[PDB]
From Swiss-Prot:
Record bears the keyword Signal: yes
Self-association and partners: Monomer. Homodimer. Molecules associate into dimers and then rapidly dissociate again. Interacts (as a monomer) with the egg vitelline layer protein VERL (via VERL repeats); each VERL chain can bind multiple copies of lysin.
Listed InterPro entries: Egg_lysin, Egg_lysin_sf
Effect caused by changing residue 98 to S: Impaired VERL binding
Summary of the tissues where the protein is detected: Sperm (at protein level).
Functional note: Creates a 3 um hole in the egg vitelline layer through which the sperm passes. Does not have enzyme activity. Species-specific interaction between the sperm protein lysin and the egg protein VERL exposes a basic surface on lysin that may dissociate the egg vitelline layer via electrostatic repulsion. Plays a role in ensuring species-specific fertilization.
Predominant place of localization: cytoplasm
Protein name (database record): Egg-lysin
Length: 131
């Protein structure tokens, strides 16, 4: 009974997703200090979804960057390495530039059921694709 290996250990994947989404969300909260009163509830929820979809579509590039670093470790990788790298991604990407773009150009997505489903997931469970 064969089993397919995950392409990244579940605990490492979870640490990345939790830290990335937490960091993107924190910057959204700060941006909403100024812009929350000029956006509807469904626009704000759509921006939370934007954070998750952004992670999903950039995941392959993140895996290249993460693996380049991990490959260069002269020791066994551990979960804390992934917490750290995920926190770096989640904090360094200044997502406010993108929120400003969407708001200014009237491209905040219409909030749909699929987006609500993604938003209601635990960050640990947001689907990512390796292949």
């Amino acid at each position: 009974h064969y089993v397919e290996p995950k392409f990244l250990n579940k605990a490492f994947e979870v640490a990345l997703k939790v830290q990335i989404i937490a960091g993107f969300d924190r910057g959204l909260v700060k941006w909403l200090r100024v812009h929350g009163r000029t956006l509807s509830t469904v626009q704000k929820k759509a921006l939370y979804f934007v954070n998750r979809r952004y992670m999903q579509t950039h995941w392959a590039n993140y895996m290249l960057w993460i693996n380049k670093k991990i490959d260069a470790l002269g020791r066994t990788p551990v979960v804390g390495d992934y917490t750290r790298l995920g926190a770096e991604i989640g904090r360094r990407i200044d997502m406010a530039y993108f929120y400003d773009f969407l708001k200014d150009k009237n491209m905040i997505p219409k909030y749909l059921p699929y987006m609500e489903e993604i938003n209601r997931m635990r960050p640990a469970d947001v689907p990512v694709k390796y292949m």
